[PDB]
Design a protein around this nucleic acid. Structure first.
Lengths: 51, 121, 154, 124, 142
RNA sequence: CUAGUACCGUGAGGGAAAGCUGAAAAGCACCCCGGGAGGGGGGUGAAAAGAGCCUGAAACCAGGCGGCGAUAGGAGGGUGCGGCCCGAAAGGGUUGACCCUCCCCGAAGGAAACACGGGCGACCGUGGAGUACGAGGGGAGGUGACCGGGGUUGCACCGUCCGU
RNA sequence: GUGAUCGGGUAGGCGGGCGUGCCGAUGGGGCGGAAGCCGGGCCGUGAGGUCCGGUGGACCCGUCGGUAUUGCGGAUCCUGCC
């Protein structure tokens, strides 16, 4: 989850942050933890020991 | 039935005295406070006097009745400190009051007086 | 009726007053604000004469708040001024509606006075203009609400 | 008496005590509409350095005397009450009652009547 | 209003006293401003005041400085120097003062104070000049 | 939710946004103005909650009220003393607000007038006197209704933003 | 009880408290009006808590013990509005 989009960074020297964005309009940010719709940084995992 | 009381009032001259105080404050000059009415009836400035029925402790106005009795001043009862002080014109309660230069309510005031004479004797 | 909107006016008395509104108008809110300032406090007949003179361009309107690059005008107190014709027309229609409403209420149309005149910004209608180097930028219409209350003078 | 004296002390101290607010609470609406204290942590901060002309920071000296800490200005210890069964186990001599805000009118009336019987001061 | 005759008084000491009076709250009038004295050598004194007069903002001469050429205004300006001119208190104090050359008709035959701690018999050395001399060298109509 | 949909790319391929009337449509009959969208009176409903529909924050904008407002200098604040205005009673208060006078105890600290003397003098020593005062801790009588708070602002002293 | 021989603090170590969502228990509130929102009071060094009035129309809190996608001013941060 959050790991499905295909992204590209445009890099430096453009007045904007270096942030992975999708390639087709509307060119919204994707995949990274702090983006809306992105992967969640440290999510609950089924391998955790409860017993 | 508190202890330092000696009388009973019907609602009729109760509310009559209500209006009497209200319009006395409005028209002439009057005096609200336990020490105040003590001093009124001491110096002999007291035309009519009122005490409250919600007075804790019973030490605060116990003497007013006898000292008025002695100097021959009329003194009546009223139920609520709240209404008492309100008609006295205050955001606060009040325990005993006295009237002076009473205009516009001689009828009412000495009528209360005669009714309390009858209740007394 | 159909009170979709309300008024900023407080203390409305229906025995003495009448109301009128214009909603979602495609006019400038800045010019609306400047012009309603000038009629606040007048009698309706005088205000209608003033509006007709503005529409004919015989009397300018002072520009006290929104006045960038604006020329001055003949006479005393100028200073920057304009002639906003579209806004004056729309306001004329609002005022005539108010007069009708007062007269079907039963008030005297020669003793009416404007005691409330205010313009509010309405919703924006969004558009776009093509530019150079592959850009399209915004090209938008700003809308206006206007409300008026008149009172009868004893 | 000692308690009256310490209540006086508390009153004076808490009249002199300032309202403790973060560095620039007056400059941005994001801080005006939620006013709180936060510790300044910046290397170059004047309120951290405690320099003259700059607002003050909270410290353990501003605390009130233990005997009177947390008391109502009347002088009583408050107890929240949600029903009449909580009224008893109040000591009318040093405790007073505050009725909870979510209690309905039906019970407000009952609680006030029972408090009048027992002689318990109700602060609201 | 206290009226002070400046005849034979040392300018700076006079000004110090007057500034203190104006700050304490009194109205003051100085007469015979041209007859106050300045001690020292004429060349150094005149050079100082001429240098004062040739000071101006290079980009706009309507922004000053505006150091004086007349005698009454020299005296006024010295007093101003001894006050807190940048505050409202100082501005009000400075408005409570007036200085005059000679004695105008309105003050004739009246009580003229004198400030004892300013007086030139106090002096020993005779190297001194007069404020009127300075004004004349600078080009003032008195 | 009419989503691998609309849409973009010659093509492999890339890829959104978008939930809530009310118990019931009972979803505004009728009159005046307006070219019209609509406005105003009237109606339904417990409530307009009116489909531009539960609640309806902030930023932003308009008007009304209050205070300031055209001789004036500092990162927009801090301390202290004042002016104009507003009040709830959840804080207090006639079961006594504020203020005025008198009696008692009083830490560290600590006067002056005055009598004599020393010093060229600025001053000092002795006694007055550890007195009169003095943070504060108690008492007694005169008075009779505000106080605390809040908004804005004047005067004086202080103050070169935040993160790195 | 003792402290003339305790009272500044960056990196950094240690101690105690405030706040948020769900569970096992326990005590409770709510159409005689819950949560949320606006404006004001009191307590608290403080993080914060609680009351009054208004708006709203259906759920919520305290204590004991557990659990966690648990606290933002900043990333030429992300989305939306101005």
């Amino acid at each position: 989850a959050g790991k499905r989009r295909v992204t590209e960074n445009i890099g430096k020297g453009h007045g904007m942050a270096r942030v992975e964005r999708i390639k087709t309009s509307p060119r919204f940010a994707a995949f990274v933890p702090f983006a809306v719709g992105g992967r969640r940084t440290h999510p609950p995992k089924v391998e955790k020991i409860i017993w | 039935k508190p202890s330092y009381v000696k009388f009973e009032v019907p609602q009729e001259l109760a509310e009559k005295a209500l209006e009497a105080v209200e319009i006395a404050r409005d028209t002439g000059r009057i005096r609200k406070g336990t020490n105040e009415t003590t001093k009124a009836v001491e110096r002999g400035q007291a035309k009519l006097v009122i005490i409250a029925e919600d007075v804790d402790p019973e030490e605060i106005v116990a003497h007013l009745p006898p000292l008025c009795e002695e100097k021959e001043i009329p003194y009546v009862y009223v139920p609520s400190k709240k209404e008492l002080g309100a008609a006295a014109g205050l955001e606060v309660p009040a325990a005993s009051v006295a009237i002076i230069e009473p205009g516009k309510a001689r009828e009412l005031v000495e009528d209360i007086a005669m009714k309390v004479k009858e209740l007394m004797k | 009726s159909r009170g979709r909107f309300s008024y900023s006016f407080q203390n409305f008395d229906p025995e003495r007053m009448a109301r009128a509104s214009g909603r979602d108008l495609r006019i400038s809110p800045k010019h609306s604000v400047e012009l309603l300032r000038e009629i606040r406090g007048m009698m309706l007949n005088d205000a209608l004469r003033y509006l007709d003179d503005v529409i004919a361009k015989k009397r300018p309107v002072p520009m006290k708040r929104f006045n960038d690059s604006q020329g001055h005008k003949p006479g005393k107190g100028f200073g920057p001024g304009r002639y906003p014709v579209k806004v004056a027309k729309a306001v004329k229609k609002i005022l005539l509606n108010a007069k009708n409403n007062a007269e079907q209420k039963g008030l005297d149309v020669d003793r009416l006075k404007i005691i409330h005149a205010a313009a509010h910004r309405g919703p924006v209608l969004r558009g776009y203009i093509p530019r150079a180097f592959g850009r399209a930028t915004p090209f938008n219409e700003q809308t206006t609400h206007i409300e008026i209350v008149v009172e009868e003078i004893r | 008496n000692e308690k009256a004296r310490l209540l006086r002390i508390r009153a004076k101290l808490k009249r002199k005590k300032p309202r403790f607010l973060r560095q620039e609470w007056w400059r941005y609406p994001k801080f005006k509409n939620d006013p709180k204290w936060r510790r300044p942590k910046g290397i170059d901060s004047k309120m951290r350095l405690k320099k003259k002309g700059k607002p003050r920071s909270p410290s353990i000296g501003w605390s009130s005397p233990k005997a009177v800490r947390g008391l109502h200005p009347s002088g009583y210890e408050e107890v929240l009450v949600h029903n009449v069964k909580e009224l008893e186990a109040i000591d009318p001599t040093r405790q007073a009652a505050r009725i909870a805000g979510t209690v309905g009118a039906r019970k407000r009336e009952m609680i006030l009547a029972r408090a009048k019987e027992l002689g318990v001061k109700v602060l609201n | 209003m206290r009226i002070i005759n400046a005849e034979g008084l040392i300018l700076g000491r006079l000004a110090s006293k007057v500034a203190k009076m104006l700050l304490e709250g009194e109205e003051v009038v100085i007469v015979n401003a041209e007859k106050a004295i300045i001690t020292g050598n004429r060349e150094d004194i005149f050079a100082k005041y001429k240098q004062r007069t040739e000071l101006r903002t290079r980009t706009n001469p309507r922004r000053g400085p505006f150091y004086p050429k007349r005698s009454d205004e020299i005296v006024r300006r010295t007093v101003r120097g001894m006050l807190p001119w940048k505050t409202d208190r100082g501005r009000k104090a400075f408005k409570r003062l007036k200085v005059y050359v000679g004695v105008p008709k309105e003050f004739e035959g009246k009580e003229f104070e004198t400030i004892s701690e300013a007086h030139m018999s106090r002096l020993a050395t005779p190297k001194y000049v007069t404020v009127g001399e300075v004004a004349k060298f600078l080009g003032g109509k008195f």
